Design a protein around this ligand. Structure first.
Ligand SMILES: NC(=O)C1=CN([C@@H]2O[C@H](COP(=O)(O)OP(=O)(O)OC[C@H]3O[C@@H](n4cnc5c(N)ncnc54)[C@H](OP(=O)(O)O)[C@@H]3O)[C@@H](O)[C@H]2O)C=CC1
Ligand SMILES: NC(=O)C1=CN([C@@H]2O[C@H](COP(=O)(O)OP(=O)(O)OC[C@H]3O[C@@H](n4cnc5c(N)ncnc54)[C@H](OP(=O)(O)O)[C@@H]3O)[C@@H](O)[C@H]2O)C=CC1
Ligand SMILES: O=P(O)(O)Cc1ccccn1
Ligand SMILES: O=P(O)(O)Cc1ccccn1
Lengths: 398, 400
C-alpha cells in the first residue's frame, strides 16, 4: 500500500497513526520510525510494525535500542541523530511522512520531506507557526502535498473544494467560491469566569478542561485561546487566507471541528467524536477513506451546540496572535517561543494566569527582529524570544 | 455562458432560480420558460429574461400569453401543451434544466431532460418518489447529471465525495468510504405534543410551523414527517443507499440541512440560512460557486442545535414511507398519491390529523399493483390510489 515514514512515532499522534496502520495493515507499510528518547515504546513499535529503519535523535537512546532489538531478534536498522531523521523523511520509496515531532526539532526533518516532494501529514506546530512562509514556498517548489492532521485544519480541509485540496497553499479561495474559513475553538475552562477572577486562576483550574484531558501546556493554550491564535496563523498559511477570509468562533461543545463559508451562502463543516485517529486516518487515506477505529458520532447523545464571538478582553492572546501574523514570521516565532516560556512559568506558579498574555505582549514589544529568510533565522528568533521572556518572568517573580 | 430551461418557471423554485440568474447575467442565459396557467408572471419573466421560447401547459393560457407578448414587442415564441414542454427540456443548445414543475405533470418533462443527457437541477418530488427506478436507470443510460435542489438532498450532495457527485445514482457508497446518509428533519409543530392529543389537532395548528413559512400541504407533511418519508425514498434512489445506509434524525432548528457519515468517523454537513436560492445556486454553478443573494449564516444569532431519534408512534407516515420503499415504486407511488388525498381531506376538515397515516396505510393495504415499468404505468398507479383514497375518506366522513 502506501509506504510511511513516521516522524515522532512514540508520541501521542505517532501512536494514534500506528493504530490506524494496525487497523489497515494491507494499506500501509511502515518503512521508518523516528523518535527522540523513548526506547521502550520504540522497541515495541519496531517489533510490531517491522520497519526497515528506526532512528533515535539521542545517541545513547539509539545505542540502547540497537541492543534491545538485537536481544529480541529484530533486524530493523538503528540510526541516530538529525541527519538520519531527515534521510528517513526523504527516502525515495516513501509516499507519506507523518510529521509529528514536537517543537523546533520537527522543522528540518519536516522540510526534508517537503523538499523530497512527499505527501506530508502535517502535525508539527512550528512548521507553519514559525516557518509558514518558507515552508509554503518550498511546497510550491517541490509540489509536496500537505494534508493537515490538527482537528480544525483537517475539518477545514475536508470542507474545502477539490481544486483547493490539490494545490493546498497555492490555490485561490475567492476563485474557488470560498468566502471564509471558520476556525472553531472551545473557549476553554474560563469561558464564563468573571474577568476579575482570571488573575487568580490556578494551574489546576486552567488545565481542568471539562471537555478534554490533554497535556498541561496545550490545556493552558486552550484557556488563553493562544491555541486558536496559533491555529489562526497556521490556517492563514495553509489555506492562503487573508485576515478578512478568517473567522474565529467559540463553539463550547467542540462537536463541529471547523467550517468553510461559500459564495452561495452554504457552509460546509466536519463533525465527529473527539479522537485524533479520525483526522489522521483521513490524511493517510485521502482522497479515499479507511476505518480508523473511531466509533460513529451519536447525535442523540450530544449537548446542544452553541456558538459565540470571542472577546479579546477575555482572550488577549488570540488578538496578539492575529496581530503577530501581520508583522511576519519573526513576530509569530517570537510569540510561540515567548508563550512556551510564560505558560511553563504559570504552571510552575512563578506568574499568574493573566501574566501569560501580558508577558507575551511584553516580549513582542521588546523585540523588533527582521523577517527570517531560512530555518537558522527562525531558530535564532526563537532562541532570543525565550531569553527575553525568561528575563520578563524573573523580573515579575523578583 | 450556461443555457437553461426552467420547467415551472412561475412557481416558488422557478422565481428563486430566476433570481440567481438576475444576480449572474453573464453566467446563465434563459433559453426556455415553461409553466401551467400563470400568464401574468410568465409575461414579466419573458420581458426581463428574453427567452427564445415560453410554453404554457394550458392552451388558453398560452393563447393569452402569445398576444400579450407580441404587443409588448417581445420576440419570445409562445408554444402550448406537454409535448412542447418536453421538447424545451430536450433543446440541443440547452445545458441545464431546472425541473421545478409540481406533481405528476413534472414527470415527462423531467424524463425528456434525462433522455437528452442534460444536467438536471432536480426539484420535482414525484420524479424519484414515484419513478425512482425508472429515472435512475434512465440517467445511468444517458449519463445525465442529476443535481438535487431540495435542501436535504443538496446538503447531502455537497457532503459527498467528488466520485459520487459525478456518478450520482451509479457510484458505490461503501467503496467511496461512506457509511451512511444522515437525513435531518424539523419534527414539525407536534414534536412534543402528548400522543393522545394528535387526533384533535386542527389544520391551522398543523400548518403553524414555528420555524417555516411554506404551503399548507407541505406543512402538514412536515407535521406527520411524511415529508421526511418522501425524502427518504428519494435519497435511497439518488444516492444508491440501502436501508442500513440511511439514518433519519430530528433536528428542530433546521440549521444543519443534512449530513454524510464516513468510514473514519468523520461526518460532513452543510448548514446555511433557510433560503432556497442557496441550493439552487449550488446546482446551477456546480462544480464552481456563484453569489445567490443569500446572506452569510450568523452563528451568533442561532438557537442551540439539538438532535433526536424519530418515534414512529409519533410519526407513523415516516415508517410507512420506509416500508413502502421495500415494496417498490407501485407502493411509493400509491403512498404519495393517497397522502395528497388524505392531507387535502384533513385540511378540509373531512378527517382528523391522525386519519392521514391511518388512511394512507389502509390505501396501501388495499392496493395490489404490479411494479410499474414505464411512466404511464406510474400514472395509472397514481390515478387508482387516488380513487381508493377518496373512497376511504368518504367512508370515514359518512359512516363507520
Ligand atoms: N497531540 C495532539 O492532539 C496534536 C498535536 N499537534 C502537534 O503535533 C506535534 C506532536 O504532538 P504530540 O504527538 O502530542 O507530541 P509528543 O510530545 O507526544 O511527541 C513528540 C514526539 O517527537 C519526538 N521528539 C522530540 N524531539 C525529537 C527530536 N529532536 N527528533 C526526533 N523526535 C523527537 C518524541 O520522541 P520521544 O517521546 O521518544 O522522546 C515523540 O515521539 C506537536 O508539534 C503538536 O503541537 C497537532 C495537532 C494535534
Ligand atoms: N418549494 C420548495 O422549497 C421546494 C419544492 N420542491 C418540489 O419542487 C416542485 C415545485 O415546487 P414549487 O416551485 O414550490 O411549486 P409551485 O406550486 O410553486 O409551482 C409549480 C410550477 O409548475 C407549473 N406547472 C404546474 N403544472 C404544470 C404543467 N402541467 N405543465 C407545466 N408547468 C406546470 C406551475 O405553473 P403555474 O403556476 O403558472 O400554473 C408553477 O410554475 C414540487 O414538486 C415540490 O415538491 C422541492 C424542494 C424545495
Ligand atoms: O478548541 P481548543 O479549545 O483550542 C482545544 C480543545 C479543547 C477541548 C476540546 C477539543 N479541543
Ligand atoms: O424538515 P421538514 O420538517 O420536512 C420541512 C421544514 C420545516 C421547517 C423548517 C425547514 N424545513
Amino acid at each position: 500500500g502506501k509506504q510511511l515514514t513516521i516522524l515522532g512515532s512514540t508520541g501521542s499522534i505517532g501512536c494514534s497513526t500506528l493504530d490506524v496502520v494496525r487497523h489497515n495493515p494491507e494499506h500501509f507499510r511502515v518503512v521508518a520510525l523516528v523518535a527522540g528518547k523513548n526506547v521502550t515504546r520504540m522497541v515495541e513499535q519496531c517489533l510490531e510494525f517491522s520497519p526497515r529503519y528506526a532512528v533515535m535523535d539521542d545517541e545513547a537512546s539509539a545505542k540502547l535500542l540497537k541492543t534491545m532489538l538485537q536481544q529480541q531478534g529484530s533486524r530493523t536498522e538503528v540510526l541516530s541523530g538529525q541527519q538520519a531523521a531527515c534521510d528517513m523523511a526523504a527516502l525515495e520509496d516513501v509516499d507519506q511522512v507523518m510529521a509529528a515531532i514536537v517543537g523546533a526539532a520537527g522543522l528540518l526533518p519536516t522540510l526534508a520531506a517537503i523538499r523530497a516532494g512527499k505527501t506530508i501529514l502535517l502535525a508539527n506546530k512550528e512548521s507553519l507557526v514559525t516557518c509558514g512562509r518558507l515552508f509554503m514556498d518550498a511546497v510550491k517548489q517541490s509540489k509536496a502535498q500537505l494534508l493537515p492532521v490538527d482537528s480544525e485544519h483537517n475539518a477545514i480541509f475536508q470542507s474545502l473544494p477539490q481544486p483547493i485540496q490539490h494545490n493546498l497553499g497555492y490555490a485561490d479561495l475567492e476563485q474557488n467560491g470560498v468566502v471564509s474559513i471558520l476556525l472553531t475553538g472551545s473557549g476553554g475552562p474560563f469561558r464564563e469566569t468573571p474577568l476579575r477572577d482570571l488573575a487568580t486562576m490556578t494551574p489546576d483550574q486552567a488545565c481542568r478542561h471539562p471537555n478534554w484531558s490533554m497535556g498541561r501546556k496545550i490545556s493552558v493554550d486552550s484557556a488563553t485561546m493562544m491555541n486558536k491564535g496559533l491555529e489562526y496563523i497556521e490556517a492563514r498559511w495553509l489555506f492562503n487566507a487573508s485576515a478578512s477570509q478568517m473567522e474565529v468562533l467559540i463553539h463550547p461543545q467542540s462537536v463541529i471541528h471547523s467550517m468553510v463559508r461559500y459564495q452561495d451562502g452554504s457552509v460546509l463543516a466536519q463533525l465527529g467524536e473527539p479522537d485524533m485517529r479520525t483526522p489522521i486516518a483521513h490524511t493517510m487515506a485521502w482522497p479515499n477513506r479507511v476505518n480508523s477505529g473511531v466509533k460513529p458520532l451519536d447525535f442523540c447523545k450530544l449537548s446542544a451546540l452553541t456558538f459565540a464571538a470571542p472577546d479579546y478582553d477575555r482572550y488577549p492572546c488570540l488578538k496578539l496572535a492575529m496581530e503577530a501574523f501581520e508583522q511576519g514570521q519573526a513576530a509569530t516565532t517570537a510569540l510561540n517561543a515567548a508563550n512556551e516560556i510564560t505558560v511553563a512559568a504559570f504552571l510552575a506558579q512563578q506568574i499568574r494566569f493573566t501574566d501569560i498574555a501580558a508577558l507575551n505582549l511584553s516580549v513582542l514589544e521588546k523585540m523588533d527582529m527582521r523577517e527570517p529568510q531560512c530555518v537558522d533565522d527562525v531558530l535564532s528568533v526563537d532562541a532570543n524570544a525565550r531569553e527575553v521572556a525568561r528575563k520578563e518572568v524573573m523580573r515579575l517573580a523578583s
